[PDB]
């Protein structure tokens, strides 16, 4: 039995796999946040990253997992509390690759210790969390560190925010469909 | 034997479950909060997220394990006590796939400190349960996330609160058809 | 079954890497800091070796890992901080030959604690992941510590900056190949 | 299958590896420094070093980790710092035999910390892989150890700079013959 | 498969090297250097005994590892340092036999720090490695400890220093035939 | 296929092997040092031993490892350092027997700390090898320790220091029959 | 294979050990040291146990290992040196069985830190393998602790010292009858 | 084959030594020293019961080794030296069964430091040496607990001490039916 | 071949053994102590149990180690010591079945520091393989807890102490079935 | 070969135990004693419970081993001993599925600190066990935490007190049909 780190990838899977992570983003993938220095910074949401990657791998094809967070400091200044959070996320696929990156979480000017604390903590998890699927490709992510790419995205036109149809939204706890495939599975 | 971890999804049920993670909870699933500042946070419960799991993977078809949970700190201040808990959870699915995610536990303004520490660790597992879930799709909250979908979600009518049949609600403990089958399993 | 780590070339995907790694990079991979002094370096992005690496060998083909990273110094002057990161980085291929490098990251002149960690840190680990993969071949980045491979670039005509073409950019999660090559694999 | 470290040599492999480590180095690998007593010193670079062991073994067919790297000490005088560092490199090839080195990096007479730290600590990992390639034999830097080599080096007339073509350079990501190769080595 | 370490020798390879072994090493492998109190002693350089063990074993036929290495002492009088090195060497065969020595490194009178540690601990390695390889015979350095051996090689008469021919050196990375071999291999 | 450390020895190798351990070393074999106090004391020399043990098991018929080494002191004393080192060594055949012992080594009077060190832990590993191998039989040295035995030397007429031929000396690192029997092994 | 630890004892071979290893040592064995006391004490020397455990067992049959060596003490008073060593010495067979033991070596009123430490140390891992040794049986030592069978031997006549004839002693390395068994065992 | 700790008994073997270890030990066996208070305390000697092991099991049926040992105290008074060390000692059978039992030892009243630590460490090893072996029988110094033994063997008649012959003592080293025997096994 | 711990007991000696476990013992076995308080407390000696598991189990039925054996406390009151020492004690029989139990010992009132030590650990060690005992039935002592039980014990009559029959005991070293059954199983 | 904790269980073996852990237990189990506040508690004794596992499981069907024991506090009060003990007590079946509780041990007034500590550290280690017990079902014990059983039990008229015969008392140690069963098993 080929259990989650001891499967193989098919031809067809690794050929189609290995030319859908070439493509680049479009706009409707990058949101913009403005960072020190009134500059615009583009990046992906990261619920944005998650589907993505279980589109690219399947929900049982990619795994990730917090190999360590450190808390490098919890300081008061004026009542208000600066905290920094790095996390090392190891992202591994069904076939055994992976990638492991570094993400950083930072909490600044708030009054309480556990919102800092909690909010600096997720967001390194997160951020670590992109910075390893980006190196799977540009579809993951990678492309968003291309200054050429970036130029090319702001010459196009803004496109209007989407509008999400709430009529087949999942409303009861069963999934008859996955139950029966689950008992024919036994 | 295939035991847990090592049993391979089939076909069938990879594309069922493939299909049913990807869309979106109705609102008959989110609640709302009341942050700090006055705007109105929405979040699933958690034992609505542990059905979730429990229909979409089964009961034996998802694991969690606490793999470490830390006490940042528990402060003193006016006789009030201020405690912040991490909980580091990991999601494992019966053919071996994981996810690992951190849950933060708050709990400020508790004269008790052992009321505060025991609502911060709980709440700090229950959160590190869910965001740890998000991972796997839509279904089990990751769409909470999306503003697009926060958007579409509050212009639809307010539905009734749901009301419990409890009628064909379990009375003893006995349960005879699970006594068959297991029985008819011992050999 | 063959997972990561286990995997052995064959005679024609061995022949064809081992010639690929073996030529220089054009121009149009070379960029050009400035570092303390007024000399001009050269360097590749990270990006770009993430993508020469994932055409090289594969997006299951090259996995990389942080066996360490060491803060070795944080210091305050002036109100500026001062950090220097150390990254231990280890490459590991399909077939399991891995090359291990050390990274270094560095921020000075920052106000922000929070801001020169996560710099120092995400630099370190980058720097790492650069240095090691230069060990396979002159086309992961080994040509560029080359004085006579420099002196051939600056003697090459200036090239326009490149053009980036949105128009087959993925704009859906869902990816149509690749989930008909996953079921099929099931 | 023979995995990375268990991939024993075929006799060919074995003898033309045997006899192609046994020669030494023209003068096109040798660089010179100029170490404290105005002495000169013979050297290979790093890179060269790196293209030599990926074409004696193969992109494949060897493998070097670090297994420990120690700080000595950082001093600072007169505003200046002067840093020690040593490393243990571990070189391997793909039938498992192995050879360990210290390699050492130092930095003397700069401002920054950062900027010393760096450089000690590259130079100790790559002052490493060096030494410890040479233990298997002259065409990896072993021959430059020999007194008489070195004077037949310096007795040889003076080459010209080499000349690069880049007409023939890597323009682009994509590797078809490297894809197509993959692609049927797959299934 | 035969990786290293558990490769049994044939009777052939074994007696011949068994014979080899067993030789005394010529007047053209030891020099002699001066120490303490007006005496020669007499030594072979660390890179004829690696010649020799590559030549006894093959390159692929012997391995050795760095076990441990302690600094026993960095001390500084009249600004000039004096630092004692000890490393432990382990010398293995192909199948399996293994040797361990400790190794000595010493750097005395030198003004920079990071010099003395430098010679000291690469002497310290290499005195290691010379140690561990006597173990075997002979013809790895067994020899140089007999004193009738150096009376013998002192009455012997003085050669001339050694001419190395550079007609026949290598002037490009490639090796045809080594790559033929190893694509043969696959 | 049999590595080290899992060769059961044959009948014949055991039979050889067990008559020639017990027979005694003729006087060829001791040295004489003076101890303090006048009296003579018979040893036999570290690389006689060695050859001695590479000629009854052959030369990877044994190993040796250093399981620990201590320096038990370090003392200055009117500018004369007094230094005692302890070795364990382990000495184990082709089959997997063993034998360990402790070795000391001692550096008295000498005004380096280094060179005092250097011979105290070079004097414990040679010490603790001998003492290893003494455990094997009266061959390897263990009819040293018996006091009929030296009586039997001292009544023995003193004989000529030996004299070492060096016609047959290697001169060459090649070694064309090693290189024969090797290359068709493979 | 039947590595060492792993060969059970043919019938013949056991019976021929238990037999042996009931006998009582003769007057040849026992030496008499002069504890405190004016007391005679009986103890056989440590090299004719070693050569009685390599007939009895053979030297491929038995082994022993310094499980843990501990310095209990290390005083100074009135210049001179009073140690207690205590060594656990673990001897096992070839098919696995082991006794474990304490041995303890004391060095007394000696000046030299170094010479003491020395002393103790030998003669805790010498006592610690005679004491386990004892435990196979009456003729490695077992019978040593018994009364009467001191009374018996203080009752024999005593014998004359033993005389070693030399003629037979090993003259060189080489021994002819165990390289063409080994040779023939590839 | 089977090596020591994986050996199971056969019925023959296992029916024979259950019961010889179930004997009680004559007086030839028992010895007495003068505990404090005055009293008779009989004792097994400890090279007896080696030879009782070794009689019962075989030389290769039986192992001990030492857990661990713990000096319990040294104390220094009026120049006299106290010492407690204790020891667990661990028997095990070649069929693989165990015990594990505590031994302790005792010098009081000597000058010597070294001497004191000497004799209390052998005695700690040896009783637990004897303690953890009665735990397999009374022919292994069980009975030796039982007061009803104690007061039949005081009943018993004085026995004259042992003579030992020593006309058949082992004069040399060689044991040429060992050699012969071992040879033969060798192939 | 079934090591100890492996070894399955068959439908006939479970059954033998379970009847036998349930029988409650005889006033044969119960020694009574004066505890604190001036009552009578009954309690089964140790070598009683130790006989009682070697006929329940046989001699290679059952083992038990030590866990861990804690001093909790040595202390000093009138030149009188007071030592409390807990130990853990399992039981395991040749079917992999265990139980773990806690054993105190005590000694109060003595002078000597090493008298209370050895009394208390023995103590410590035997009360644990008691308790460790109970577990598996009455026959072992569980009985020794039942007031009902007690009750009935001191209605039956003081019987006479036993006699001991030295007649047929052990008297030689030599078990001649022993050793040919032995000679046989090889 | 299924040594414990790999032997499986038998259709009939898991019927007719599923059957009897779901009793409850009569009044012949249950003693009382007074704690603090004059109320009275119902337990079962700690021999009773070995018995009940015995019968229920068999001798070689349950185990159980002490995980961990730490003393929580030895305290001195007006020359009074109090000590706290816990204990982790892990009860194992033969199929391999497993309950850990944690047992408290109290010794509070005593004078002796030797005997307090022995009283608190074995009724953590039973208390424990019997904790861990009452997991497998009412028989075991887990009736006696019912408030409506307690009532039922209160209700019954009040038995006299067992009478036990000591006719069929074991009192030799050899068991004849044991040695018998276990010679055969030998080979």
């Not at 990261?46 to 929900?59: D, K, P, S």
């Not at 390194?124 to 050429?148: E, M, P, Q, Y």
């Amino acid at each position: 039995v080929l259990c989650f780190g001891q499967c193989q990838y098919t031809a067809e899977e690794y050929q189609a796999i290995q030319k859908a992570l070439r493509q680049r983003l479009g706009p409707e993938y990058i949101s913009s946040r403005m960072a020190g220095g009134g500059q615009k910074v583009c990046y992906i949401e990261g619920h944005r990253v998650i589907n993505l990657a279980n589109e690219m791998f399947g929900y049982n094809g990619w795994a990730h997992s917090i190999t360590q967070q450190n808390v490098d400091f919890v300081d008061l200044n004026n009542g208000k509390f600066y905290v920094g959070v790095c996390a090392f996320v190891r992202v591994q696929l069904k076939d055994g690759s992976y990638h492991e990156d570094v993400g950083y979480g930072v909490s600044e000017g708030l009054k309480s210790k556990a919102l800092s604390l909690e909010k600096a903590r997720k967001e390194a998890v997160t951020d670590g969390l992109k910075r390893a699927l980006r190196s799977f490709g540009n579809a993951l992510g990678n492309c968003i560190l291309d200054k050429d790419y970036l130029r090319s995205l702001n010459k196009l036109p803004r496109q209007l925010p989407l509008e999400v149809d709430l009529t087949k939204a999942k409303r009861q706890d069963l999934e008859p469909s996955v139950e029966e495939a689950r008992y024919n599975s036994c």
